[PDB]
């Protein structure tokens, strides 16, 4: 059964792996229900913010919890985001009001900050081998793309089935059975600071080496910020298509970058991680330029994979690379090595709403694609210097 | 302070069984599962069981399921392995170990404290 | 069951030299693998948890590695009190197996 197989046996780091995945997953299926109930001073500064609110806070609270998580510890950091999460849920669930709503939101980004950061953190600390850390870091990112992949099918199933409410009070019970795995599995009432003092935020930021991982990932994660908002409006504007083409137009890039989000974790490390970010890079910016020129889906289906798969491998890249260099050139505590590359990632998702919508008014989607792909493609070089970083340690 | 102290010699005759003792003090007894493990002379260490004095859940060695039966007395803070049907293979020196979790987790990183071990030997 | 083999039972070395034990797993024991030492007249204490990190009290000179299914432990400098057993564990899947030991010997 399974009483017995938990109850008698040496708990692993497998169950922390689960742990993070599983808040990974919930988070960014939180994340993607509520943009089909988002539309239900006047729609336009307020849908905007309404937007934006989570990964701006997000993005504002990283570096707090990177050094607080030095400071006592992960497992407070971990369990605070599960009830933080539970809560905005609950609160999700009731209130009608734009104030409430956006305050849900806000909640919701401060405790995905604290999972997140909390969750990096802690997987580098207990796997210090750079394969096994690579492999874990790749299996825990599928999290991401496992729940925006099944975040707006679950929500759509029940917004009609059910009711209105109905997405969030299901949601609440996975959060709650997430909270009673980590019970199981960590000690969330002791302050466990940790060894040694680990380097100043302004140390790391100055290191060229880590200003490149964390850039590349940066500008991946733009390209497809920006590109899944403005996709439909240029789809209806060119191709005329229905409202149901909309949905399955983005279905390609992300199955993609879910696949390639696990397999190029462990993949990554046989071939170089500086190649893989490169042709990574390369790829999605190659693809990003292929979009505009595509007359219908079918021309569509193909770069959105490319996109996808390469988006899949330069994270997979770059995470463990981050924590690696901390431990080759700096004190191993990856504390606040992660929220940088938090707020790497949050970035483009505080951005590209805004600003793609912009500029696609400004100049139009295909120099909007231009642009993005030609960044991509500049970049790509920079990640020639991550092949032997010195130690000079 | 954790001690698991554990007797010194025993002598048993060919064809019986003997109880081996491990009196853990300086820790909470029944939050920590224990190991009993055997060395024989001038061979490798085997492993013979797992116990959890709180539930008393036990995991066996497939050699040594019919040989070893691990028991607890919490009231005392004991841990007990009785050999039943002993015979000169049986004789080596035993130890008890205790599992330690990482900090601030569950998970098992390493047998932090073992007992020292009890020299059984079988003649008559 | 996983037999993690260790090749010599005994290893001569004179103080100040670097010494290294190596125990072979047999079905990719992914870094689960602890090094314990036994002083002669003590019993066993931990030196290496997951393969690579040293526990806490353990000097500088003991460091652990990984190339695989082959996991080492080096002594860098080693010393009159470095002679003693030390052997291999494995937890990936029960039943848990233990390397044999090697022992560490003076030379002249």
């Known amino acids: 059964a399974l009483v017995r197989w938990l109850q008698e046996s040496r708990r692993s780091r497998k169950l922390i792996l689960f742990i993070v995945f599983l808040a990974l997953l919930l988070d960014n299926m939180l994340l993607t229900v509520v943009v089909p109930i988002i539309p239900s001073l006047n729609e336009n500064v307020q849908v905007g913010l309404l937007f934006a609110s989570k990964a701006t806070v997000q993005l504002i609270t990283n570096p707090f919890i990177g050094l607080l998580t030095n400071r006592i510890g992960y497992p407070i950091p971990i369990f605070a985001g599960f009830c933080i999460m539970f809560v905005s849920t609950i609160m999700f669930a009731f209130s009608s009001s734009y104030a409430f709503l956006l305050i849900a939101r806000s909640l919701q980004g401060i405790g995905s900050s604290c999972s997140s950061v909390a969750g990096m953190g802690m997987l580098a600390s207990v796997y210090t081998d750079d394969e096994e850390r690579g492999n874990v870091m790749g299996i825990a990112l599928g999290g991401l793309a496992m729940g925006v992949l099944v975040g707006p099918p679950f929500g759509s199933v029940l917004y009609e089935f059910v009711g209105k409410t109905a997405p969030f009070l299901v949601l609440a019970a996975l959060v709650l059975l997430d909270g009673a795995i980590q019970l199981f599995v960590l000690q969330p009432s002791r302050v466990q600071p940790e060894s040694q003092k680990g380097t100043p935020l302004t140390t790391l930021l100055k290191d060229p080496y880590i200003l490149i991982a964390a850039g590349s990932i940066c500008f991946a994660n733009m390209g497809i910020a920006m590109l899944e908002p403005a996709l439909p409006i240029w789809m209806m504007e060119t191709m005329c298509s229905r409202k149901w083409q909309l949905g399955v137009a983005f279905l390609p890039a992300s199955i993609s970058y879910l696949i390639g989000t696990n397999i190029f974790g462990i993949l990554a490390h046989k071939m170089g991680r500086w190649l893989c970010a490169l042709l990574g890079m390369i790829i999605v910016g190659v693809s990003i330029l292929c979009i505009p020129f595509a007359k219908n889906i079918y021309g569509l289906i193909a770069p959105n994979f490319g996109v996808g798969f390469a988006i899949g491998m330069v994270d997979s890249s770059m995470m463990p690379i981050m924590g690696y260099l901390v431990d080759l050139r700096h004190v191993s505590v990856y504390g606040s090595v992660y929220a940088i590359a938090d707020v790497a990632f949050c970035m483009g998702y505080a951005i590209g709403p805004s600003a793609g919508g912009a500029i696609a008014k400004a100049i139009g989607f295909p120099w909007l694609m231009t642009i993005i792909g030609i960044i991509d493609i500049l970049f790509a070089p920079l990640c020639f210097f991550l092949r032997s970083p010195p130690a000079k340690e | 302070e954790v001690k698991l102290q554990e007797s010194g010699a025993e002598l048993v005759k060919p064809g019986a069984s003997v109880k081996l003792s491990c009196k853990a003090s300086?820790?909470?007894?029944?939050?920590?599962?224990i190991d009993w493990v055997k060395q024989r002379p001038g061979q490798g260490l085997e492993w013979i069981g797992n116990?959890?004095?709180?539930?008393?859940?036990?995991n066996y060695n497939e050699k040594f399921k019919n040989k070893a039966t691990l028991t607890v007395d919490t009231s005392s803070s004991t841990a007990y392995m009785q050999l039943s049907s002993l015979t000169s293979d049986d004789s080596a020196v035993y130890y008890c170990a205790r599992e330690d979790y990482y900090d601030g987790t569950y998970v098992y990183y390493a047998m932090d404290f073992w007992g020292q071990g009890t020299s059984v030997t079988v003649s008559s | 069951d996983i037999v993690m083999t260790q090749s010599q039972k005994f290893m001569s070395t004179s103080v100040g030299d670097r010494v290294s034990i190596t125990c072979k797993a047999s079905?990719?024991?992914?870094?689960?693998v602890s090094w314990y030492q036994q002083k002669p007249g003590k019993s066993p204490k931990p030196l290496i948890y997951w393969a690579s990190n040293r526990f806490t009290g353990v000097p500088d000179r003991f460091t652990g590695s990984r190339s695989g299914t082959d996991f080492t432990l080096t002594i860098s400098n080693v010393q009159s009190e470095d002679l003693a057993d030390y052997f291999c564990?494995?937890?990936?899947?029960?039943?848990?197996?233990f390397g044999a030991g090697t022992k560490l010997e003076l030379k002249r």
């Open positions: 079905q990719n024991v992914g870094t689960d």
């Open positions: 300086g820790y909470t007894f029944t939050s920590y599962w």
């Open positions: 116990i959890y004095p709180g539930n008393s859940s036990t």
């Open positions: 564990e494995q937890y990936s899947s029960y039943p848990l197996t």
